[PDB]
């Protein structure tokens, strides 16, 4: 193996430095993984592609115009270049090596494709058949869409695009299904908190957020239980960005936000999946909890959980590491059959008031096929009224002691119409045994005489017993 010799592989300091300050790819690379045999598809507003950086890995088996209802996803040309973003990603995943031309993806050996779906209306419709593109040539897609990252929005899936998630994790990849890599959001400015994302929210995402050159929380980051890693982005002035392709055949350093770094993940964990085709979407999971690094990212909420790993909810488990996760796939044992335990836990319904707190001891369904002593993802499916949402902060605190944020205050939220049966949903007790007492908090952040009920709460577990 060689270093690239593409003239900005310099430039691109998540991938070139030499000062511990990157992703580990180089690492990945010179054990021999540069993403051969693994097709990804970017879900944006189209792909360039007859660029020249990747032309030569793109791919039309991964790719389609949605908006169009047509074969070709090339962008849509106009004068602010405005369908720009889905080219941008794509070169991050899989821009072509030693070519002279831009740098180099993640994945600089893996086919590209995208679809053009956001340029147009963007139904459910248009979401399910995006991502429902192809799942048995496609192993990986990239997407950072979803609800108005306002700070006020409380929405996720409709039904189509929720059975597409169901359906591609099922049976997609021959069974070992369809990897949904996503961004965790871009609201840091309206105080957003990402649980409130449907999309990345699910169990279905493997849901990233982004660091700053200098190891710091971008101003645009959104911080949540949900979230699973962190790859590099931009940040300040001071600080570089990501370095790519652009459209009209050009080449850009200033593409930015936590949309950067999904696809910089998308590609990590195409080289992943080169070193074992088998693994499945939450083997991919198990991977990233299990390799990533806390390691010079700076947050005041870094806590260690019931298993000994360090978690944020800015960062998850910290910055993805491409020689660790190429390396632990290579003789990684599959996972056991996922299993669900659904406890309802109310008797009757609760006032809320000022703070309410709700505790159950769970036996997580001993004696039951789905008795889980390994957890994965766990929800706080809750059910309440209240007179403004947004004034409200939950956590949840598991046997172990570890309490995730389910939610916190967001400002801007004015919502009188509460929560419907949401999915709050935390990765900080993975591994966890959730076995005993559960704790959930819920608060009035404000000085305000704020009022309503909590009807429902379901904690619903995911894992296995071994
Ligand atoms: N939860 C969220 N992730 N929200 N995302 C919101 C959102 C809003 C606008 C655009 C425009 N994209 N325009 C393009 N790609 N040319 C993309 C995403
Ligand atoms: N369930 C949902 N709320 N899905 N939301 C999907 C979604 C939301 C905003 C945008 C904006 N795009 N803006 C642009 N293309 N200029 C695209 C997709
Ligand atoms: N803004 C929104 N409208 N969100 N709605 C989301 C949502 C998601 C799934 C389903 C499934 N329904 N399945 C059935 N009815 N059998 C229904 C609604
Ligand atoms: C993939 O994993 C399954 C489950 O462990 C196993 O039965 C199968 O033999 C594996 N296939 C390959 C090609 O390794
Ligand atoms: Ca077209
Ligand atoms: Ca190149
Ligand atoms: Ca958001
Ligand atoms: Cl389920
Ligand atoms: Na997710
Ligand atoms: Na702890």
Redesign the pocket.
Known sequence: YQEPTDPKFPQQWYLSGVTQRDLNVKAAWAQGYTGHGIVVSIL??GIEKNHPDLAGNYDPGASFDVNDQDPDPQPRYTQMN??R??TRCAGEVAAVANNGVCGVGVAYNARIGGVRM??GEVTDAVEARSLGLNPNHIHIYSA??????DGKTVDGPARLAEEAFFRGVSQGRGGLGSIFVW?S??GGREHDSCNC?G??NSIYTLSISSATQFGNVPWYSEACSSTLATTYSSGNQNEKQIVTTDLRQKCTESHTGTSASAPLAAGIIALTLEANKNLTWRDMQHLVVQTSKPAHLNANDWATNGVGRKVSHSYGYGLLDAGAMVALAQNWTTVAPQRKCIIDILTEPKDIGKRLEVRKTVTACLGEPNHITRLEHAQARLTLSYNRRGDLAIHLVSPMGTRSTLLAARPHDYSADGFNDWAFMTTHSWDEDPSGEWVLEIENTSEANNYGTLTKFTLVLYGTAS
């Open positions: 944006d507003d405005d369908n973003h889905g956001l340029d950072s869409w979803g609800p108005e990252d961004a959001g871009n994302d999309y990345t």
